């Protein structure tokens, strides 16, 4: 589309500028343009893609939750009827969120995952696939809610199997995947016990491997481990 005439290196340069300017919609469009050049992405470029889309969808999710709460309050007894506007606007925001998730899923399917052969790239993209199905699940209510949940689970499970065979237990991508799969289990799949088990086993195996790390790698791994502990504190 609109980024077809810009050089790949100029799209990456401008994504970095858009990050500094907190222009995340622009950042996402620059990175979608870069992916569509057809070349694989390096680690730093996967980070730019992830940051851009997480910020865009994160705004949409926050907005959707505010509107869903208002809508739920409207549909209780004692609530004066206000017309179709709250539902319509929640639907508008929901549709836009679904569109961003479908855009990301489409980049991963065409053709990021199929060309990803190293563990860091393949685990990252499969985690991303699980995350964006998870965001679709958060808003799903129809006959496809179960299939959307199963799509997220399958992606996370494929990523988990590769991560456990190919990466050390302190690898940040491995840790971040396990964190988000544990969130899936607790918040989407009605499986709090599976969530707690995964977060505990992940934390314990990482703790045991910290001695192998440099000071800088240690700081990276312990950051995510603190998130696992914060969730265990919340869940128990």
């Amino acid at each position: 589309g609109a980024m077809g005439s810009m050089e790949r290196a100029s799209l990456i340069q401008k994504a970095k500028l858009a990050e500094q300017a907190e222009r995340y919609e622009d950042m996402a469009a620059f990175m979608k343009g870069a992916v569509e050049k057809g070349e694989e992405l390096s680690c730093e470029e996967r980070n730019l893609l992830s940051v851009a889309y997480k910020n865009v969808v994160g705004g949409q999710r926050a907005a959707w939750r505010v509107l869903s709460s208002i809508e739920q309050k409207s549909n209780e007894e004692g609530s004066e009827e206000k017309g179709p506007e709250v539902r319509e606007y929640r639907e508008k925001v929901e549709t836009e969120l679904q569109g961003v998730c479908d855009t990301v899923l489409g980049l991963l399917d065409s053709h990021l995952i199929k060309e990803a052969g190293d563990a860091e790239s393949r685990v990252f993209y499969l985690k991303m696939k699980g995350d964006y199905y998870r965001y679709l699940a958060e808003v799903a209510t129809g006959d496809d809610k179960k299939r959307i949940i199963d799509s997220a689970r399958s992606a996370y499970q494929e990523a988990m199997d590769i991560s456990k065979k190919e990466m050390p237990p302190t690898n940040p991508i491995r840790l971040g995947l396990a964190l988000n799969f544990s969130v899936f289990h607790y918040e989407i799949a009605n499986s709090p016990e599976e969530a707690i088990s995964l977060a505990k086993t992940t934390f314990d195996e990482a703790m045991a491997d910290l001695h192998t790390l440099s000071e800088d790698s240690y700081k990276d791994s312990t950051l995510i481990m603190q998130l696992l502990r914060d969730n265990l504190t919340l869940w128990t």
């Binding site: 992830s50 964190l179 988000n180 969130v183 918040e187 995510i224 998130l227 914060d230 969730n231 919340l234």
Partner: peptide, 9 residues
């Protein structure tokens, strides 16, 4: 209220 997922880093 909601569980913490991976942040932007």
């Amino acid at each position: 209220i909601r569980s913490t997922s991976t942040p932007n880093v």
